[PDB]
């Protein structure tokens, strides 16, 4: 996360981290329920085997809150393509259920129509992760959060060197040096409503980090709610 502030105790309880066999975090994820994690499809190509950690805010210590969970099933969207990054979404079934507590709770899944008319019409949303703090620096050891303004769909396409499909959307700033960066992929994009946070997006891709004239590209969650339900039902 370039800029933004750090997630304080219990401010981003739905953050999940994907860690490889070496124990380092490469992608984020969102807690949907005790057994489910929402992530980015493209994140599934960055490791042969990986576990999921919850309740962590500092990657170089033991707040006693941390907890590692093994992935039982990996439900990836079959229509996902690297060539286009479209359908960048995947769900994870854990072998053991998450134990909710301080810093560990789930983000709500909204109704498609309501989400589309009341959540994404809001001024901002929140993106979080352990990604890089600068485009060229290294991974961050502290979980961070960043308020990212919703961007006009038209403006979005104009700024993109790539085709923005209907399954994505822009969030961020045109010039302000705040945006997500690599290592935040698959992380949470939530929108606040009356003190309640709903999962609205999945950190998907971007052309650099916070570059001027560019935005962060998130996976449009409302476009896969039914896919998600189906993915959890079984």
């Amino acid at each position: 996360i370039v800029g933004g502030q750090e997630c304080k105790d219990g401010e981003c309880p739905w953050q999940a981290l994907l860690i490889n066999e070496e124990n380092e975090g490469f992608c984020g994820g969102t807690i949907l329920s005790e057994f489910y994690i929402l992530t980015a499809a493209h994140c599934l190509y960055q490791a042969k085997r990986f576990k999921v950690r919850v309740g962590d805010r500092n990657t170089e210590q033991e707040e006693g809150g941390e907890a590692v969970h093994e992935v039982e099933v990996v439900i990836k969207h079959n229509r996902f393509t690297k060539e286009t990054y479209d359908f960048d979404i995947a769900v994870l079934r854990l072998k053991t259920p998450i134990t909710f507590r301080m810093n560990v709770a789930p983000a709500c899944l909204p109704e498609r129509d309501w989400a589309e008319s009341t959540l994404m019409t809001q001024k901002t949303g929140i993106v979080s992760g352990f990604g890089r703090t600068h485009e060229k620096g290294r991974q961050s050891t502290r979980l961070k959060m960043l308020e990212v303004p919703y961007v006009d769909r038209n403006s979005c396409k104009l700024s993109s060197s790539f085709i923005i499909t209907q399954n994505m959307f822009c969030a961020g700033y045109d010039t302000k040096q705040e945006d997500a960066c690599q290592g935040d992929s698959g992380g949470p994009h939530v929108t606040r409503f009356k003190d309640t946070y709903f999962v609205t997006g999945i950190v998907s891709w971007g052309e650099g980090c916070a570059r001027k004239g560019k935005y962060g590209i998130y996976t449009k969650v409302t476009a896969f709610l039914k896919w998600i339900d189906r993915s959890m039902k079984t």
Binding site: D9, T196, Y197
Partner: protein
């Protein structure tokens, strides 16, 4: 700004108009209150709520 377009129909969460009339509902983990608008958590860690002390 009429029904749900008017302050989300005064609903805590999901709002939808069923026959020119507001009908509120809640996310998994909550139960609609008796007033039909508020959402009462069903457990200690309802979805979408920050955990503070």
């Amino acid at each position: 700004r009429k029904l749900c377009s008017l302050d989300n129909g005064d609903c805590d969460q999901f709002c939808h108009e069923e026959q020119n009339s507001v009908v509120c509902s809640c996310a998994r983990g909550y139960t609609l209150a008796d007033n039909g608008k508020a959402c009462i958590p069903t457990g200690p860690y309802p979805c979408g709520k920050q955990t503070l002390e």
